[PDB]
Amino acid sequence: GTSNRDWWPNQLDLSILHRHSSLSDPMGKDFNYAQAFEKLDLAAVKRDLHALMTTSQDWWPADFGHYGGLFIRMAWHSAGTYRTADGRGGAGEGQQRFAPLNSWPDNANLDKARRLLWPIKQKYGRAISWADLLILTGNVALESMGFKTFGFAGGRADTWEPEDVYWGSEKIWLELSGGPNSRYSGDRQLENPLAAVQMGLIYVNPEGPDGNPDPVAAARDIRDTFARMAMNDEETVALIAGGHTFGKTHGAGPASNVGAEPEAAGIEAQGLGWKSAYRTGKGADAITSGLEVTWTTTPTQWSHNFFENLFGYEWELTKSPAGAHQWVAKGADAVIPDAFDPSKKHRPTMLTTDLSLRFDPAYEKISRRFHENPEQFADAFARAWFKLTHRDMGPRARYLGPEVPAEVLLWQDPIPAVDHPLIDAADAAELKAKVLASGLTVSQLVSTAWAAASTFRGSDKRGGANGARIRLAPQKDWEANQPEQLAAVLETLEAIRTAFNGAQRGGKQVSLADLIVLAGCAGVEQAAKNAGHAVTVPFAPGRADASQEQTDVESMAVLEPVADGFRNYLKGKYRVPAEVLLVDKAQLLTLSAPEMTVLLGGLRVLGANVGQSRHGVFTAREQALTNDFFVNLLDMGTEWKPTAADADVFEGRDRATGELKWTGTRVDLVFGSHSQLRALAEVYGSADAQEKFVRDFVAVWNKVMNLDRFDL
Amino acid sequence: GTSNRDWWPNQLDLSILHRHSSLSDPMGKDFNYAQAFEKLDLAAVKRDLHALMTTSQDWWPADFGHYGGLFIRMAWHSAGTYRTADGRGGAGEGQQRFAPLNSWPDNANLDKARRLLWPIKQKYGRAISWADLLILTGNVALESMGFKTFGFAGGRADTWEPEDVYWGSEKIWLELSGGPNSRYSGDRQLENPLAAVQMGLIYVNPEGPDGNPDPVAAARDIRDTFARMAMNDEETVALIAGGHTFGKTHGAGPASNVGAEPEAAGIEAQGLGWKSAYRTGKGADAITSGLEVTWTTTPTQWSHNFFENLFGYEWELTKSPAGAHQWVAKGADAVIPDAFDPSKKHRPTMLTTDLSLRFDPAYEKISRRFHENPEQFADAFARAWFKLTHRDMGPRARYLGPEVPAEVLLWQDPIPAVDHPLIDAADAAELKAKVLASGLTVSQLVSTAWAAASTFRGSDKRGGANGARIRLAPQKDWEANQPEQLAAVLETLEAIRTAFNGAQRGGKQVSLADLIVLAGCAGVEQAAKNAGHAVTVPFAPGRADASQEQTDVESMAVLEPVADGFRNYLKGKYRVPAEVLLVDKAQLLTLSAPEMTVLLGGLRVLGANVGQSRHGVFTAREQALTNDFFVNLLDMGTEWKPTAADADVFEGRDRATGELKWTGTRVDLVFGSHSQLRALAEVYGSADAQEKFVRDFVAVWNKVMNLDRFDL
Ligand code: HEM
Ligand code: HEM
Ligand SMILES: [Cl-]
Ligand code: NA
């Protein structure tokens, strides 16, 4: 059947805002995963996973009698989709079991790994999510093979449909760069927000860049893609050498033997894929990547034999049985055990990307230190493996269970504990009145609280107003945050805070993080009062103030809004139309299309625009909370045309007189153009809508203020 | 951005079961449109609509100074998408304001019509839906121009995103037949469920079949497509001749002047399209269809002039100024008024499809009767306009407001009023015990109640267990209903009814409609008991029994299930795979994916399959309510393969021994294959899920039993 997407392939897609509906979720509306997990017998789950490691199934025999390597790869792939640019991908939603990730070429035969785990998932049911189980299984694999992990947190709730992620524009799996849809431009610049070199790869091509077996060139792609997954050089070397301490690759025969990926396979395959016609199709005959490399002399035991081999041999370019480029140790004895035949041994082998760790000069120094000091290697790998597998879990408050590491890590964007009584309802009312009596305007108060709260993204649960990081580098100097106006607001609020905290007893005090949000609440209540409407905006205290020393300024760079339609802000010109960037922002903020619509219409008339731009400010009572944006936008008395100067800025003129009434961007006018958004704008721009508009605006304002409040 | 649909364009689409979520809806979850409409001042709205008729806007000037013809077309097009095959389309959800219908070629310039209504929509807000307003505007247009309508019902709730409808497979607007995606095969057979001749037309091509101007061949397409929209010869003549008593077509210059349809237009067009470069692009210069026809001497007044012209002249093939085929009266005077220039008059003109009403012998007889008996024409048109505009509104219990016709019409599938006390909980316990003491099995009770209730479709709200039409022609004869088994169950239930009603005083009695549903509830209770579970199934009395004479047997044919995955039933071999037909059926039953999953797993083990097929009966305890279907389906100890005899039937064998354990269809195994359906099956197949399965099953069973219960 022909669909709207066929007819109008460039129209905005709002369906990404309406995922994860109660409709698609088999659990009751009252289901609380954290409550279920907190009663899990995690020790009993880990004993079952431990037994599983050495219980081979004939439909997918265990290499060396041990599934550990397979399950470490499974858990690394689960986590390895993560991109810092948007926070999308990662292990935190168990998306490996859905399209497209269940059928990526780099996830070949991880369908078998997930199927091995169904008996344990079935036993423990809703008390352990697939998302937690994939990571736990990787931890138990490591533990069973003598590696001490840094710890584990539960709390990744299962999802029930694919995430809407931009994985790239290529129409061919693993397409080499330089195609019609190339993800590369300039001097090998990978397009944001991608963090993989080819469609369907986790990071890089194990042969080398676009198949060129050059370890030095490969090292470039490794460093670039790992940095885009939040890993520096030490972490990257620790992870790759740590992983490739275990197990083997699978390339026993030509790739033409391997059939359809799971999403393409026949219904009889019952959710599995990559059925191989090569000899037995599994075990000693397995084909996965097409490479055939076994790194260490003890693939089922933690060792420092990866670096011993990397540095102890010279390497020769060779071909797998599948015709893939790989390396073998020159002059070596057969010292590596065979996966199935206890009478066969093999020479040491390496991937191009393994040799990167020796032939890139910066990796070489780290790899030599790890070689000489394997206790340093073990500790870096444990820390990196925790970071990898938890990077998208959000604040430490979300971490469940008895194995949570007590060490607070800089990458967690940590929030200090609150040690003192919180302000009560009367205190909140006193502070709101003091804020409004200071002379801070509605526009200043709403703009500041919006700037602080709207860094949250639900993709990796980073950002939000908790921490008061808006006062620190680098948030205080982001262009979108209007640094000089922000500095003046924060100075006034800090004087209000000092006076209130000075006057208290019993150690009661208010954080600046709370006061910035409460001040924004006062701005919204004042705007409602300006409109002739008395409303109370909800407020929940208990935010704390993080220090500069507790803030990684480099990691905070990815949270900078370079597009924020809710402030009519675009840092520069992009490929992507501004309205597409608005819907992307609404998705990160976890907003529905109705929530996005009411929030944007209200922010316009409150003065939230960066630079006090008039664009979309369709009111003659700025700083009053009215539905004026919608009533004026939908007024057929006004005709719109793109400006001569700028095709992305529109003039609204009286249709009769030609008088200039308004100007607006694409972000403003899309609400009068897109057939689904216009239907929403009509509800809010109706004569009966003033009370509904205020209520809905207050609701979505409060939602945004609370996005990072996992402490509640 | 490459999507899962791009990679796997044949995988099942579950998103059609999760549309119309609370997420996309701007109204509160408690919003009750019926209650809002009941408070509407309908008299005030109709005064506003009467005023609008002659209030010309310069951006789309009114023909003859009266918008009535444009609005009648707008309302006819709102209703005219309806198909009897699936009940999809029609006016009942206001889908003309969304993609794709807002942009169909046949809906060109109806964007202008809807925009003229925005001020009235704005003024009355949520108290009148767009869906109600489009039809009410059509009524007022007719009343304004002298035609007395049969009545009007409110209660069409607005919807907030496009309906998932198969409109055809063509990838070109208006493609003529015989293309690579032809909707025609054999002797001009239109594929079910389509009810138009070309992609983006309402019914037929006004020039003639595939543009061939043969009124006789055109009559064939008119008959077929109108029959597929529930209209017979009399209704079809009345509707076309009635409509074309008013207004005019628009083709003042070449179609090449007309730009992008609304969904393709620039953002500055603010939701309008078909902007024309021809002269002023509007009014006298309007281009809509490309035809230039005005039917009557008084296009803004009800007249008998359509049939006077049709019969009173001989017709000559000619071309509009756009190059379209149409017909001019041989030797006629210039009697037709111009829409704008009082100094111009025109010869009578007709479309090919108008001449059909004369040159098709069966239409000719009706047209002549209407010409000779104008009162018969007026009454037929009024009744057909009502039916057209209310055909998808469902039972009369949904009809709101003060203009609802009292007359009960056969096409409404009327239910008699209940005039007696209903059974209470004590009676329901007594009737269930009698049902279970009769010897009727779980399989018989569940199968009969499923057969009765599952005819419902939310597309046009036809069907369901109310009326006990399963005992009448043609439902009692449907293969899916197992006529011989059905007859035996009904005979036993009618004997229980007779004995219960015979023992009552005070006029209390139970309908067979109620007893069938209650007996099915007893079956489910007995099944739960068979599984060691104490369960009560909710039951709401108040169904009444319709007569054979209240049941149009030809209209009832389109509800016949030729595919019902819930009974593992396929009447023959279709081009669409069985699992796509299962999701289509779930959508018509208003089920979510979780609901569809739990229902199907439960029905399989209760013995609801047609013919007692073993396909999908993955239990050793049939007629016990357990999650066995899921636990056995997900057992990796079983391997599945298609049979030699039948690629659509699968054998489940022990992996280790090769012993046959089970057989299943595509409908069974899709729950083990589709990545999202398998995630749902896993929840219900987990060790902690038996009580959840039972309670979810009872909830969705009750939901299906109540689908048509608008009396509640
Ligand atoms: C440049 C980065 C990396 C590349 C190109 C890479 C490439 C590969 C390839 C091609 C395979 C063979 C797949 C097969 O045929 O079965 C593999 C296996 C594996 N990788 Fe990596 N890898 C990378 C990083 C990592 C990391 C970060 C980890 C975990 C910390 C990891 C752990 C493993 C394990 C345990 C296996 C063995 C699977 C088995 O025994 O079945 N890899 N890798
Ligand atoms: C065989 C069925 C039909 C055909 C092929 C057909 C075709 C057309 C076409 C081509 C136009 C001109 C559109 C334009 O250029 O503006 C039109 C106009 C119209 N049709 Fe029909 N029609 C049919 C049935 C109906 C029915 C059932 C109704 C209503 C009961 C109706 C009411 C109208 C009206 C009122 C207009 C005039 C619009 C105006 O004044 O702007 N038609 N029709
Ligand atoms: Cl639940
Ligand atoms: Na993420």
Ligand code: NA
């Ligand atoms: Na419908």
